[PDB]
Amino acid sequence: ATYLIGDVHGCYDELIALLHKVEFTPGKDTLWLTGDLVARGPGSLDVLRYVKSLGDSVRLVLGNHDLHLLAVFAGISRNKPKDRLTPLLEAPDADELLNWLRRQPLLQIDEEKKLVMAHAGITPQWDLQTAKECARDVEAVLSSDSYPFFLDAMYGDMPNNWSPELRGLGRLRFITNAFTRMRFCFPNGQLDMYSKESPEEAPAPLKPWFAIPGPVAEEYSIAFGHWASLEGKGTPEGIYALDTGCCWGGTLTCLRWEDKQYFVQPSNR
Ligand SMILES: Nc1nc2c(ncn2[C@@H]2O[C@H](COP(=O)(O)OP(=O)(O)O)[C@@H](O)[C@H]2O)c(=O)[nH]1
Ligand SMILES: [Mn+2]
Ligand SMILES: [Mn+2]
């Protein structure tokens, strides 16, 4: 079977309890994870150890907190106490875990399931070929020996409009923001990098990225996490918002793809 779980955010106990609920069995089953494996919850170290151990039985995409962890590890960004990342950063296998993490994809595609996954979704300004190319470009910089330079370049809120003519730092920054930070769009598809509210609470003319018809969403289902204030609700057919805010005292959600059946694990916090 195929299971898709939203942002874990260091909630290792909840993750294991949810996987035991569905009797997840590597070799029979595959797990998709929407990213943000780490930060806020208490068990980021255990989460990374376990997910890495799964190998081919897991399909991960990196989220904004995964990238921020990499930036802290590389000395690019400052450690925030509230992220609770010190046990992971101080672990004896930290190098092995984080060099594995930076090699993971930003985008997962299954053509037989007609299923696409990224942390924040697929901007309506991208067709599939462009999304693939952009993911490849950023994954290439992240898996290179020079990844700290890219992590430093990644921070920024502009440009917020895609163009095939984008080059250099602006191109990489847009790609990173689209895959890992996107929530709201302007009517022309341009990213808004400030509003994190629920769709009903946001200011006009902002709309969810998934409320703007895009070529990927017309042909593929899209699963994503990231947008906790959406509470996994209010999405169109074919759009699966899996982040129900476990680290926030909400729930961890698992979707079984074959029958679209949901399983939920309450937060222990
Ligand atoms: N207004 C509102 N904000 C929320 C809610 N849940 C989370 N947030 C906020 O959203 C901000 C970004 O958190 P989140 O959506 O989990 O994404 P992440 O930071 O990438 O992991 C956090 O600082 C939370 O305070 C909610 O239910 N309502
Ligand atoms: Mn998150
Ligand atoms: Mn996120």
Swiss-Prot record:
Broad EC category: hydrolase
Keywords, ordered alphabetically: Hydrolase
One GO cellular component term: cytoplasm
Function noted in UniProt: Hydrolyzes diadenosine 5',5'''-P1,P4-tetraphosphate to yield ADP.
Record has Hydrolase as a keyword: yes
Activity regulation comment: Co(2+) is a strong stimulator (100-fold increase in rate of hydrolysis). Mn(2+), Cd(2+), Ni(2+), Mg(2+) and Ca(2+) are weak stimulators; the two latter act synergistically with Co(2+).
Pfam family, one: Metallophos
Molecular function terms from GO: bis(5'-nucleosyl)-tetraphosphatase (symmetrical) activity; bis(5'-nucleosyl)-tetraphosphatase activity; hydrolase activity; phosphatase activity
Gene3D superfamilies noted in UniProt: 3.60.21.10
Signal peptide from the UniProt entry: none
Reactions this protein catalyses: P(1),P(4)-bis(5'-adenosyl) tetraphosphate + H2O = 2 ADP + 2 H(+)
Protein name per Swiss-Prot or TrEMBL: Bis(5'-nucleosyl)-tetraphosphatase [symmetrical]
Keyword Nucleotide-binding belongs to the record: no
EC identifiers of the protein: 3.6.1.41
Family: Belongs to the Ap4A hydrolase family.
GO annotation, biological process: nucleobase-containing small molecule interconversion; response to X-ray; RNA decapping
Description of how the protein assembles with itself and partners: Monomer.
